[PDB]
Design an enzyme around this catalytic site. Structure first.
Site, PDB file in Angstrom:
ATOM      1  N   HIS A  75      -4.235  -4.791  -4.918  1.00  0.00           N
ATOM      2  CA  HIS A  75      -5.101  -4.567  -3.770  1.00  0.00           C
ATOM      3  C   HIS A  75      -5.439  -3.100  -3.559  1.00  0.00           C
ATOM      4  O   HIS A  75      -6.057  -2.762  -2.544  1.00  0.00           O
ATOM      5  CB  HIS A  75      -4.465  -5.138  -2.501  1.00  0.00           C
ATOM      6  CG  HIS A  75      -4.418  -6.632  -2.473  1.00  0.00           C
ATOM      7  ND1 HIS A  75      -3.546  -7.336  -1.674  1.00  0.00           N
ATOM      8  CD2 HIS A  75      -5.138  -7.558  -3.148  1.00  0.00           C
ATOM      9  CE1 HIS A  75      -3.730  -8.631  -1.856  1.00  0.00           C
ATOM     10  NE2 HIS A  75      -4.691  -8.793  -2.746  1.00  0.00           N
TER      11      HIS A  75
ATOM     12  N   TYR B  74       0.808  -1.211   0.000  1.00  0.00           N
ATOM     13  CA  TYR B  74       0.000   0.000   0.000  1.00  0.00           C
ATOM     14  C   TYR B  74       0.843   1.263   0.000  1.00  0.00           C
ATOM     15  O   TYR B  74       0.290   2.367   0.029  1.00  0.00           O
ATOM     16  CB  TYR B  74      -0.919  -0.003   1.218  1.00  0.00           C
ATOM     17  CG  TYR B  74      -1.737  -1.257   1.302  1.00  0.00           C
ATOM     18  CD1 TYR B  74      -1.840  -1.956   2.493  1.00  0.00           C
ATOM     19  CD2 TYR B  74      -2.375  -1.763   0.184  1.00  0.00           C
ATOM     20  CE1 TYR B  74      -2.567  -3.117   2.572  1.00  0.00           C
ATOM     21  CE2 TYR B  74      -3.110  -2.923   0.252  1.00  0.00           C
ATOM     22  CZ  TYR B  74      -3.203  -3.597   1.450  1.00  0.00           C
ATOM     23  OH  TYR B  74      -3.936  -4.757   1.524  1.00  0.00           O
ATOM     24  N   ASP B  75       2.164   1.126  -0.028  1.00  0.00           N
ATOM     25  CA  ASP B  75       3.049   2.274   0.036  1.00  0.00           C
ATOM     26  C   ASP B  75       2.862   3.171  -1.178  1.00  0.00           C
ATOM     27  O   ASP B  75       2.718   2.706  -2.311  1.00  0.00           O
ATOM     28  CB  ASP B  75       4.509   1.824   0.120  1.00  0.00           C
ATOM     29  CG  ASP B  75       5.421   2.900   0.675  1.00  0.00           C
ATOM     30  OD1 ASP B  75       4.948   4.039   0.873  1.00  0.00           O
ATOM     31  OD2 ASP B  75       6.614   2.611   0.905  1.00  0.00           O
TER      32      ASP B  75
END
EC number: 3.2.2.5
Lengths: 330, 285, 285, 323
Positions: free
Chosen positions: A165, A128-129
């Protein structure tokens, strides 16, 4: 560290197993052929001390249950404990817990630079970075970021940086990412275009895994589809195992018969337990040094290199000396 | 005694569950979903012991510390994939040939006179108890048993048994047959879904995190809320359950029966609370 | 009537054995008739072709200039649902299907055979009227909710739905998307139909050689173990004799076909006698 | 004459034709060739093959008209009863006759498509690709996807007789039609991703083909703005009647029909395709007639990016307007 790493890599390479030698050869050939596609997982982000899922689920347990989970905290709760929160406290609490940690300006690890130095066609990404792609733009490489379904049809270049995601580009909302139990169950029905894009890049590119663990949910969900695909219809993906303890031979056999190709970083270097940075760096530096030929010692290797870079021009009556510099990458 | 006095202490929710279960038993529309807990109460070997035996035979190291959730269905795959099937079936035979006596909970289950019994286990404890008590049941363990049934009292064995020899194929304990369970067991799965749809199901000997409970909840969520009943779940953990988990598993359909709150039992005494909850169910008649 | 005595002798073993199995299932109470449109047209009931004719009239403004395509039967009403609306869609259903008609003798004899359950794809009340006039209390299962309120064990499974709740397009699967969104919309009805087919002996009556419902049912039978199901009976009523090659084709898929055109000689459209001959052969034994 | 023919066009057609040209110039146009382009010149269709299957199977010629299901049921019945040998022999006898290319294929390839996707088992488009001098990686079986040679995909969705005239290499029966996603996963995924990430123009199809319906059903599960609605070049000799057009536009097909554009006869398929193809090609070299509104709009569309730049020299302004 000046002559330490060069000599260490030289000693490591000339003792490597022939299987790993072939793996390195194939990966380098794919990389120089404009075909390599990387698969960076949660592990690479933790190299920059990025907030991990376990701390988030720990705080979710603390807030929802009044206290952190007692004893072991890896029993599929990683997907359940958040979900209950989302089904009890609602939306605002989920969003607040999400933004508390994930809103951090973190520097990029050099592992990202080494990954991007391989010139990959696409980089399918799971974490998610917002700093994995930042390392991409601080160099001279543009990657079209695809995170939601609407960004698939609006892509401009032929190189994709895929957030399977999702990510927090469109705010820190809890609906733009795949975090709770329901999203993992409904991933094939909420993100059909992204799943198709994933399976498309996987089938037509050499795949190298990194930052994952043998038994992660995403690896299993990929492997079952691989087994369902066909017999000898996919190029076998390459797996970079980076766990400290060396891999037992039985698991190696099972996973390489399940449709994987394992490169274990703990075997070829005898490093300490918690030394993840050097464990990644060893394999990444082997790939990089094999790209730019800091491994050649025998005359046969020299002449095979020259012939592999000049043989196609044997069909040309003559070649200008000026453009010969382009043959040997300047 | 407290068993007589608990009838005034039970929450109105629990009173409603007890009344509904008794009504379903009276109407002959009650099905008990039994699991590994009740079989283990009779000192039957649990699955983690077989996992350890496979791990020691395969890896050569004991238990490798704490097992992961997926590890309980991965080591047998690694064993079947390289070692083969001969050693797998041999180990299953040695570990599972013993015939443990029937625990009292199995007697109470048949004393309740259920319409059907769906069992996820892999032992014939319920078969032996039914043969002892004289209540005839129809065994459904494989696809060949769906077509030929004598009476409308199905002992629905969803995971298979060792009746047709101690072989891996008959019983579902691997990973591949867990994914291919719907494909390999279509008729039994359809019968199971229909039986839950028409009848009232009370779950016994299960934990809130079990695989079958989760898959059944997944199949339930897609159904119409007004067209489906809420299955009863009887939890026998030794710890008092908190409200958040109860809400999460209540909006998910299951009706949680907390044995920890009803009876102040110990931590390593499953039989105490199992018997207490069965007796509370029975005494309502 | 007075001519079946010789017909018994003319019929080969392939039909005699089918009749014997049907009679054995009937005497054991394990026979289910899967009827549909085809015995409904014998009561002059409005067929679907008139409905699609009305839709095409109100849509393109002209009558059919030829024969309707196979997909058009499912696409023309859908067009009417998407172009005109929903109230316009069910206005014709309200004024056109809502008709009082008597029950033909075949419907009465179907229940005179005393089947354990009957599954019908029709939208009418002919079977319900026959059940009411005979006295067999069949629990009608037509909507999704009724599955949770089955009073009796004998189900009058109307898979496609009813107009009892009203003459609405959402209560009956007619449009193409409704056929496409069938398992998602009707999980319990599909499960019940599959379990009844698996656990009993199914006899098809009043069906053409190939339609949508028989096709998907045969596919679901195909995705089964090679001996997990009992081969169903098919009563072909087409005026022409059934060819042998397609007979072998449809038998290799797991069906046993009994025609009437080969059994008796009749006219182009006298379907009453064609159904009556086979039904008399079945009931007499 | 054609200049004012471009004028007698509905605004929907006017914008669709310019969108297709923009995609073609942008390297984003992916053509979707179907049955009807192949059978244009001389290629045999499925109806006569089904007729001979009926002959070899049922004895007597087909009576009446066979229904849509029979198109796949009859060959399947023949394969199940008589076996694979006779089926393969019939296919070999039918599909060996080489037929010359037709100008419609040249026009299709003249729009420089990024990819072309076809359900034709023939190599008419393949040969037209070779003869024109444009390279395309042929993908028909799963193993080709792994062994793709270039970035341009000539995708034969239903297969072809390039490895031999056999029934397994082509999707013709009902079994392989029903079990398509279980036999051809990779090529189906490649088709879906190409349709999602590029611009799709259906040609040759007639709203009565299994592939079109499968694709339209696939569209329904793609959110709202995550997909582009593919174009549709219909060439039936009948007006669209303006209700099925509404239905298919709501379902995701911007239909373009040749019956409204030109007044051809009922046996003028060649002219029906050629009118639309020439209209599309001639619009790739020039824009429509302009007014005071659009001339300034066109200039602003070609000059606005240069606004961020402080100054631009005069010699390279020819590159801005492309000489």
């Amino acid at each position: 560290e000046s002559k330490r790493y060069g000599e260490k890599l030289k000693e490591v390479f000339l003792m490597l197993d022939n299987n790993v030698v072939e793996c390195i050869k194939e990966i380098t050939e794919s990389s120089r052929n404009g075909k390599l596609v990387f698969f960076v997982g949660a592990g690479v982000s933790t190299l920059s001390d990025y907030p991990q899922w376990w701390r988030l689920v720990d705080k979710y347990h603390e807030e929802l249950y009044g206290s952190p989970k007692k004893g072991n905290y890896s029993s599929d709760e990683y997907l359940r404990i958040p979900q209950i929160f989302y089904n009890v406290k609602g939306e605002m609490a989920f969003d607040g817990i999400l933004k508390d940690f994930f809103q951090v300006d973190k520097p990029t690890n050099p592992i990202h630079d080494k990954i991007l130095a391989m010139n990959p066609a696409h980089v399918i990404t799971t974490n998610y970075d917002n700093l994995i792609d930042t390392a991409c733009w601080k160099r001279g490489k543009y990657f079209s970021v695809i995170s939601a379904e609407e960004d698939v049809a609006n892509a401009t270049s032929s190189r994709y940086l895929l957030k399977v995601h999702g990510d927090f580009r469109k705010g820190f909302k809890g609906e733009n990412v795949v975090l709770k139990e329901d999203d993992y169950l409904n991933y094939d029905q909420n993100y059909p275009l992204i799943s198709n894009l994933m399976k498309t890049i996987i089938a037509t590119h050499t795949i190298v895994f990194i930052g994952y663990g043998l038994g992660d949910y995403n690896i299993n969900m990929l492997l079952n589809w691989v087994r369902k695909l066909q017999k000898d219809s996919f190029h076998k993906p390459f797996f970079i195992r980076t766990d400290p303890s060396p891999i037992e031979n039985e698991t190696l056999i099972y996973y390489e018969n399940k449709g994987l190709r394992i490169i274990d970083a703990a075997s070829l270097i005898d490093s300490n337990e918690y030394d993840y940075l050097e464990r990644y760096s060893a394999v990444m530096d082997l790939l990089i040094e094999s790209q730019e030929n800091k491994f050649i010692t025998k005359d046969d290797e020299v002449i095979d290199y020259i012939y592999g870079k000049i043989s196609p021009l044997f069909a040309l009556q003559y070649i200008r000396k000026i453009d010969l510099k382009h043959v040997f990458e300047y």
